Structure formats: C-alpha cells, structure tokens
C-alpha cells in the first residue's frame, strides 16, 4: 500500500545519507558503500557493505523494538534504505566495552582482548573536527551537551541494550566486544537512533577470535564483506 | 624525639620520598625541579621547592583543622614535611571549576569558559602512558580502584574544593582547577601528595593574572613571583 515519498537530502555523513520525506517527523536513512577510518585518512568502497549494514541494523532494531526499547526504527524499505523517526541527535557517542580493544586498550597499556573487571560505559563528544574526544559525564553536562538526568536515562537504556545484544550474539558464537550507540529526542522522548552494525560494533568469533567487523577494513585484513555476511547469516539462524 | 630520615624510597619529578625510622611515616622533600610536557621540558626554578613545601603545609594544616583526613603531620624544614606513609591510589583526581588547560584545548573552548557543573575527572597515574584521561568505569575495569573507593574519593574531593575555593576567593584568587591524590592508610582514604601552584591553577579574580606553574609551562616570565604571591596571600 501507501509508502512515504523521499524528498530532499538533509545530510550526507561518512557512511549514510539522511533524506527528508513527506512526513515531517520521518526520515529515510540510506546506507552507502563508503568505508572510512582514522579521522578521514583511510577510505574504501566496499561493495554491498551498505546493504549488509542496512540489513543487520534493521534486524537488530526490530529485535530491540520487540524487547521494548524505544527506537527510531520503523521499517526497512529496500536493500539500502530504512524509514526512521526523525530525531534531534544528542551529540554524544555512547560506547560500551565488554572487552578492551582498539585505541582504548592501546591508551591504557592493555592487551587487546583484556577482560574488563566491570562493563565499561563511556562517552565521546560528537565533533569529528575535535577527533570525537573521550569525555566524562561532568564534561558533557559542563559544556551543555546533556543533563545529568538525560545521561542517566541514556545509560539505563544502553545497559539494557548491552544485555540483550550480548546474549543474542553469544547464542551465535559471537563475542560482542564493544559497540557505539547514538540517541536522539523525538516527541520529547529519548530514542535509540543511528545504526548497530559491523561498522559500529566489534564482533569476534567466540572460539577463534576471528574479527567479523570493520576492523578488517581498518587493519587491511581482507575479506571485509565476508565477515559482515557471516554476522548477518548467524543472526538469521 | 624527632623522627629520623632514612633511605630514599622514590625520586619523582618534583619531590623525593624518604623512609624514616617509623614504618608508617615518610618525609616528603621538595626539589626546585620543574617539569612539563611528558618530561620533555625541565628547569630548575630557584626556591620553588621551598615555596611549594610552605604552601602545601599551610593548606594541609587548614584542611586538617577542617576535619579532612590527610597524610600531613608537620612541616620539618624549608623543603621537608613529615607525612603518614600511604599506598597511593594510582589516579590523579582533577577538579575544574572553570575550563582551562587540557580540557579547554581538547574541547575547543576558550580558557576561562564557564562550566554548567563543577568538573571532576580522573587521569590514570602512569607517566609512561602520558597520564591519560579515564572515566570511573575504566578505573574500576582495569583494577585501579573500586566504585566504593571512588565514591569516597569524590566525596572528599568535593569537600576540599569547597574549602579551597573559599580560602582562595577571600584573597581574590579564583581556584580554576587542581589535581589531588589519595592513598590508603589503616583502612581509610587519606588526601596525600601536594596542593601548591605546581598542582593548581590560580588566577587573580580581578585581573586574571596567572600565579601558578603555567608561567613555567608557557614561558610567561616572573615565575617564582607568582608562587610567592600565592603564599603571601594565603598568609594574610
Ligand atoms: N533518526 C535520525 N534522525 C536524524 N539524524 C539521525 C538519525 N539517526 C542518525 N542520525 C544522524 O545521521 C547521520 C548518519 O550518517 P553517518 O554517515 O553515520 O554520519 P556521521 O558521518 O555524521 O557520523 C549521523 O550524523 C547521525 O547522528
Ligand atoms: N565515530 C564512530 N562511528 C562509528 N563507530 C564508532 C565510532 N567511534 C567508535 N565506534 C565504535 O565503538 C567501538 C569502540 O571504538 P574505539 O575502540 O574507541 O575506536 P578505535 O579502537 O577503532 O580507535 C568500536 O566498535 C567502534 O566501531
Ligand atoms: N604520603 C605519601 N606516601 C607515599 N607516597 C606518596 C605520599 N604522598 C605522595 N606520594 C607519592 O610520592 C610521589 C611524590 O613526588 P612527585 O615528584 O610528585 O612524583 P611523581 O613524579 O611520581 O608524580 C608521587 O608518586 C606521589 O604519588
Ligand atoms: N601530573 C600532574 N602533576 C601535577 N599537577 C597536575 C598533573 N596533572 C594535572 N595537574 C593539575 O591539574 C590541573 C589540570 O591540568 P591539565 O589537565 O593540564 O589542564 C592543573 O592545575 C594542573 O597543574
């Protein structure tokens, strides 16, 4: 039956385009094949990456919606596009680390794979020109990016999302190492928004440690799309 | 009578820690060594150690009298103080009342930016890693501390900020930011280390004159004068 009409492009980011629609409070999120890392210094076109990321995001957000998480996700429209509630993004990346990896393990002198003694929650300030710096709750409130009570709600939702995702991935022999979330305001409510995909998570096979995510691109490991396909195929088991 | 200084336990960038003939006491000896930028910048600043020992001693005596549990027992001489020997928790606990220095630089703010809330932050005390900014979850997650210990540290830190902000404001100094360290001692958390113009930013509340180690860091000149000014004001 009736479908939204895609109107003007509102924004093009590193990996997606956001389009207006004929509904003032809805956008279409379009997944590109662009891959980027290292403050824009590293790029590639990874054929079909956007299709896989749209498909994985859609599957995960449908699952989160069913678990009662309030999210922007309405429906997948085609191989690359999904219909979402238009949100005013809170300018914080919310990162969960179950295991220490990447730059974070590096900055603290930890072996990659270090088992953290408590689940890590952290914030990066969403400003690519400042390099998306790590900040704490007081910095975030102090510069007017958020309030204590907004952060409290964000953390509650984030912790629930981690419990749900850790378990869904564990069932399929995937360790959910870390991931990044974004939230936004819609109808005065705090919604989970953006993407949850191998671009925004670290996924290691639980037996071999094999990486099935964007680190295969960041570290020139090859078979990038095969790792993303494997994540989707396991999620669809 | 007087405790006896025995072997050196540790030489840091600014102070030496000496053992004493009491197993639960150390002597903290203030050098004239100045350092900045991950050890890359160094100088000797004549009498800096004396002024920092004098300022630290004055401040810790005040905090002791206000009921803060600290390591400080007594000043011994121009450079030395007698302190309880603590097991330092490996965190630099930084308070920022106004954004300046590294916070201002990394968040693209002007120094002097007014904050909507007092900032409490941690750096991991590991000079080989450059004392990186970390959050509470990182600190607990790597085994540096526990949530219960951090909670206590922050409660003491907030109290110390209130006392120091007021003592400095009475002398027309804005306490812009500062760094504390804490240690474990006989089951408790004590304020330890130093509170001086090496570990605080002090701006005159009217003119903005900087009276702290930024004068050394930024080659501003008249460095020791600034330290003398802070001590003289504290002694009004
Ligand atoms: N539901 C939404 N409404 C409006 N903006 C969104 C929504 N979900 C995500 N965004 C924003 O859209 C952009 C998605 O594209 P992306 O390529 O990830 O951009 P960026 O390069 O800015 O990180 C991001 O800026 C993201 O914060
Ligand atoms: N700006 C961003 N856009 C998308 N995903 C991100 C971003 N920042 C962090 N992440 C995700 O958050 C997790 C932690 O990233 P991090 O370790 O901080 O980056 P790196 O180690 O690659 O420097 C990873 O899964 C990463 O994919
Ligand atoms: N009461 C105390 N007992 C034991 N160690 C202490 C005490 N107070 C401070 N310290 C430690 O003594 C050293 C003081 O000298 P400093 O030059 O500041 O060293 P650093 O270069 O390690 O920062 C620091 O490592 C500090 O943590
Ligand atoms: N390793 C350190 N030693 C002494 N003082 C410090 C240290 N790190 C931060 N400070 C103090 O903490 C405040 C914030 O410093 P910065 O992070 O450089 O802006 C300033 O008053 C510094 O002098």
Curated annotation (Swiss-Prot), chain B:
Pathway where this protein functions: Purine metabolism; IMP biosynthesis via de novo pathway; 5-amino-1-(5-phospho-D-ribosyl)imidazole-4-carboxamide from 5-amino-1-(5-phospho-D-ribosyl)imidazole-4-carboxylate: step 1/2
Superkingdom, natural source: Bacteria
GO BP terms, alphabetized: 'de novo' IMP biosynthetic process; cobalamin biosynthetic process
CDD domains: SAICAR_synt_PurC (cd01415)
Enzyme class, UniProt record, top EC level: ligase
GO molecular function: ATP binding; phosphoribosylaminoimidazolesuccinocarboxamide synthase activity
EC number(s) recorded for this UniProt protein: 6.3.2.6
Catalytic activity as recorded in UniProt: 5-amino-1-(5-phospho-D-ribosyl)imidazole-4-carboxylate + L-aspartate + ATP = (2S)-2-[5-amino-1-(5-phospho-beta-D-ribosyl)imidazole-4-carboxamido]succinate + ADP + phosphate + 2 H(+)
Keyword line: ATP-binding, Ligase, Nucleotide-binding, Purine biosynthesis
Family per similarity comment: Belongs to the SAICAR synthetase family.
Protein name: Phosphoribosylaminoimidazole-succinocarboxamide synthase
Native source species: Clostridium perfringens (strain ATCC 13124 / DSM 756 / JCM 1290 / NCIMB 6125 / NCTC 8237 / Type A)
Name of encoding gene: purC
């Amino acid at each position: 039956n009736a479908m939204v009409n895609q109107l003007e492009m509102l924004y093009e980011g590193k990996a997606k385009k956001i389009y207006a629609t004929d509904k003032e409070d809805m956008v279409i999120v379009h997944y590109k094949d662009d891959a980027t890392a290292f403050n824009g210094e590293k790029k590639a076109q990874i054929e079909s990456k956007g299709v896989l990321n749209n498909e994985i995001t859609s599957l995960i957000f449908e699952m989160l919606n069913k678990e009662g998480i309030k999210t922007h996700f309405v429906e997948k429209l085609n191989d690359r596009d999904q219909l979402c509630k238009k949100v005013e993004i809170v300018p914080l990346e919310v990162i969960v680390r179950n295991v220490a990896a990447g730059s974070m393990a590096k900055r603290l002198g930890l072996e990659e794979g270090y088992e953290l003694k408590t689940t890590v929650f952290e914030l990066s300030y969403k400003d690519d020109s400042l390099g998306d710096p790590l900040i704490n709750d007081y910095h975030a409130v102090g510069i007017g990016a958020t309030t204590f009570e907004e952060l409290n709600k964000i953390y509650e939702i984030t912790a629930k999302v981690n419990e749900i995702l850790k378990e869904a991935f564990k069932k399929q022999n995937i360790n959910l190492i870390d991931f990044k979330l974004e939230f936004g305001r819609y109808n005065g409510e705090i919604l989970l928004a953006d993407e949850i995909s191998p671009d925004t998570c670290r996924f290691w096979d639980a037996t071999t440690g094999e990486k099935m995510d964007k680190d295969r691109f960041r570290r020139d490991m090859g078979n990038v799309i095969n790792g993303y396909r494997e994540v989707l195929n396991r999620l669809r088991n």
